[PDB]
Amino acid sequence: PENQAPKAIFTFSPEDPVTDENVVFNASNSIDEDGTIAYYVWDFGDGYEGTSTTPTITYKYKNPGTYKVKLIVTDNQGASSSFTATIKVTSATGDNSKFNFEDGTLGGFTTSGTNATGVVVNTTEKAFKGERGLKWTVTSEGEGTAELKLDGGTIVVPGTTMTFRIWIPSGAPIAAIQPYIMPHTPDWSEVLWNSTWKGYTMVKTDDWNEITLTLPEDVDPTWPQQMGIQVQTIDEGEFTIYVDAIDWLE
Amino acid sequence: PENQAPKAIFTFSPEDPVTDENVVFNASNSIDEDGTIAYYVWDFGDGYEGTSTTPTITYKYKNPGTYKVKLIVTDNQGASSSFTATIKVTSATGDNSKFNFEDGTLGGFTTSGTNATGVVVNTTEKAFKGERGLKWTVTSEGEGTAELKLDGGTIVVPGTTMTFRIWIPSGAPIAAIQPYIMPHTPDWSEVLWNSTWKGYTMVKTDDWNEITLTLPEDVDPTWPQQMGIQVQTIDEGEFTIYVDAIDWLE
Ligand SMILES: [Ca+2]
Ligand SMILES: [Ca+2]
Ligand SMILES: [Ca+2]
Ligand SMILES: [Ca+2]
């Protein structure tokens, strides 16, 4: 053996592109130690490939998704090395979440509570993705509980990790908040409870909070499910929580 | 039909118990609407069951884990309802992480960098879990890169989500930080790159940061892997990052 294969590597910018946004891929740290680079071949992971005459190339993805970008660097003697990185493209406008609230509807969500009363509307005031979300206003009367909830056919398969985005205000009479999933027999004689409990002091106030919750893989897949967010209240007061972009795979 | 079955429900405290810590389960919101409750039967999910003569019962778990706690409430006429919640118990002392650093060793981790130099030691100064972690000191000379890394047999199976805990200081000459996993052919002619990129402005400074990263399920399971943390530097300076409790399931 004798010719040394080239070093292949690239970075890209921006790291978090949106659809139809220019991404610049930069292979300039690639090098052939004992010769020169003859080809930069790019596979964009979407069905298209091309080459650059310099170490940089720009590209755009029209569809959201996670793409494998492969660079092959080939030297002046035909020896090659490759480097593959993953790039995530999210939708520039709109919201592809399982519950995205873009149709202007509540998506079956209602409110309940004890020593607290809730109302929910579809809102354009705040959203996590797209233009629309839910706006959930709670009036507490003291120590109590309030829910924003959906009954409850079979919402997720067992094993599924759900992601909730919750906008939680400062100065609110709350002790804790928790997304939940509650499978139950049709007759409600047996109830299963799954939640991600978060203390009010362990939460980003006046900001969006991303909270995950997994339905255990051993739950009966045929049991109807209630999905929702529960707030524990500790004093009198009126506060507004925003909920959007509840999402999971499949 | 005529007898109404009871309402069964409980809460517990603390929500985040450690091993051998008292947990108080409280079924006091359970009620039989048309009679009285005769039995509170508790299944603690660990092999043990018991009853309480009041709505409350205390229990301790000696082993860490996630337990299903089932309450069955039975009324004065033998009708019952059940409510099952999950409780997570973590170890009171020590560290069960895949990389826990409790043996006082580096666990195969080394440092590299360009326009930056790193040193790493096993430390008791800060840890995320248990008594020990890694202490990683980086001297930058300008725009550069530094890694804390492990080569790299087959560290995780494809599909695995790894959790890194990284303590990131304020006032550091850094632009970005990212845990990574880098499968490669034995000859290094083909490299795959997976990372969770975080800007310095999108990170909790002077605090522990929990960052997850998934190795894609389609990676060849036989390729050797480099796992590590990469810091991008932007100016001269000396900064210290603490790393502990890198963890995944299986
Ligand atoms: Ca060469
Ligand atoms: Ca939305
Ligand atoms: Ca009864
Ligand atoms: Ca440790």
Side-chain angles (χ1 to χ4, degrees), chain A residues 8 15-16 68 70 80-86 178 182 188-194 197 216 218, chain B residues 8 15-16 68 70 80-86 178 182 188-194 197 216 218:
Chain A
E15 323 289 326
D16 61 330
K68 294 163 38 64
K70 181 188 209 190
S80 61
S81 299
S82 75
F83 186 88
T84 303
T86 281
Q178 58 185 347
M182 180 175 65
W188 284 87
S189 67
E190 306 178 32
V191 173
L192 313 176
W193 177 266
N194 298 281
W197 189 91
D218 72 338
Chain B
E15 323 289 326
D16 61 330
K68 294 163 38 64
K70 181 188 209 190
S80 61
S81 299
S82 75
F83 186 88
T84 303
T86 281
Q178 58 185 347
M182 180 175 65
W188 284 87
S189 67
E190 306 178 32
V191 173
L192 313 176
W193 177 266
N194 298 281
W197 189 91
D218 72 338

Side-chain angles (χ1 to χ4, degrees), chain B residues 3-4 32 34-35 75 77:
Chain B
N3 176 39
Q4 190 178 134
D32 189 38
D34 66 344
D75 70 17
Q77 288 169 103

